[PDB]
Design an enzyme around this catalytic site. Structure first.
Site, PDB file in Angstrom:
ATOM      1  CG  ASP A 170      -5.804   7.318  33.487  1.00 53.06           C
ATOM      2  OD1 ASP A 170      -4.886   8.212  33.415  1.00 53.06           O
ATOM      3  OD2 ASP A 170      -6.757   7.137  34.239  1.00 53.06           O
ATOM      4  CB  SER A 216       9.360  19.746  35.663  1.00 49.58           C
ATOM      5  OG  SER A 216       9.914  20.703  34.537  1.00 49.58           O
TER       6      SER A 216
END
Ligand SMILES: Cc1nc(N)sc1Cc1ccc(C#N)cc1
Length: 330
Positions: free
Chosen positions: A35, A199
């Site tokens: 994770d 992004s």
């Protein structure tokens, strides 16, 4: 040193991925959910409330000759899905794919919430976010990667998650045969303890690329892709019959639909998520309404590049002095 381990989807939807981990002496192998959105290595254990164990493999520290109780240490974590777990702490030897750390904090669960009990395939979590998020009190503990990093050939790990298929976590090296083209690296902020990056934009299907900054986290422990409401609305508008369902809790779409791809930007590079990666199947058994794999982040307060996005890429988690993230197509 290096390590390399295969990671396997837990179910036919790729809801999560498990990777075998050896704990203790002699080894007790547990299948953990790696994770990158949290920083605790915790396991089902012989100490877990018996009614909260239902098919998981347990760690029994008393059978490990290298286990040592960490005096006074406890842990308690809550995840974004409302699930939780808590317990006490041992140090022990932990190995992943041939890479061994001695003295790793292994957080033994005394309590887990119902979602963990109900998933027999996940024996615990192995956190790979930054150690500043580790929940052990009163002395915070280091992640497996942080403990291994100085010994690794290079201070990196890579995630190569499969779509309906096996994949790989590598530690300490970049497998240059595992991707196509080049790896594009992008800056990381560790201010929230995550692999947080920006992004450069997105496209829906064959549509024009929209240049826009989307700050979010690379999170292998989140199933779906959570993006701003405007972006998600633009995606589902291209799926005839798709709707945001308040009762279901997000966008759903007719199971007969063909989903468009979704592209996200990493610098000037582009990662294309095929449409079928966005299909999470019937909302309930036998339904012809299907759950979408791209959902709004409006309710959660952070954008999350979860498995839907990451499995379309070869992802480098570069833990150099200034961490960065790399993405390649594959
Ligand atoms: C919500 C969440 N987000 C993370 N980054 S871990 C985590 C807890 C979790 C762990 C396993 C599964 C499964 N199947 C679902 C949720």
């Amino acid at each position: 040193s290096t390590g390399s381990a295969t990671t396997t989807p837990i179910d036919s939807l790729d809801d999560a991925y498990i990777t075998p981990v050896q704990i203790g002496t002699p080894a007790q192998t547990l299948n953990l959910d790696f994770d990158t959105g949290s920083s605790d290595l915790w396991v089902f254990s012989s100490e877990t409330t018996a009614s909260e164990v239902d098919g998981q493999t347990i760690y029994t520290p008393s059978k490990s000759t290298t286990a040592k109780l960490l005096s006074g240490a406890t842990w308690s974590i809550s995840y974004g899905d409302g699930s939780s777990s808590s317990g006490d702490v041992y140090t022990d030897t932990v190995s992943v794919g041939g890479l061994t750390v001695t003295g790793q904090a292994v957080e033994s669960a005394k309590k887990v919430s119902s979602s963990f009990t109900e998933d027999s395939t996940i024996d615990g979590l192995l956190g790979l976010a930054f150690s500043t998020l580790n929940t052990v009190s009163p002395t915070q503990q280091k992640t497996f990667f942080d403990n291994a990093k100085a010994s690794l050939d290079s201070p990196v790990f890579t995630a190569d998650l499969g779509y309906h298929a096996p994949g790989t976590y590598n530690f300490g090296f970049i497998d240059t045969t595992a991707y196509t083209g080049s790896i594009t690296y992008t800056a990381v902020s560790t201010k929230q303890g995550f692999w947080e990056w920006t992004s450069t934009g997105y496209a829906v299907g064959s549509g024009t690329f929209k240049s826009t900054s989307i700050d979010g986290i690379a999170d292998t422990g989140t199933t779906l892709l959570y993006l701003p409401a405007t972006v998600v609305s633009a995606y589902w508008a291209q799926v005839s019959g798709a709707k945001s369902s308040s009762s279901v809790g997000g966008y759903v779409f007719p199971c007969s639909a063909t989903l468009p791809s979704f592209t996200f930007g990493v610098g000037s590079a582009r990662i294309v998520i095929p449409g079928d990666y966005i299909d999470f199947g019937p909302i309930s058994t036998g339904s012809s309404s299907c759950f979408g794999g791209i959902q709004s982040s409006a309710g959660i307060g952070i954008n999350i590049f979860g498995d839907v996005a990451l499995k379309a890429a070869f992802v480098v988690f570069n833990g150099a002095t200034t961490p960065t993230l790399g993405f390649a197509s594959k």
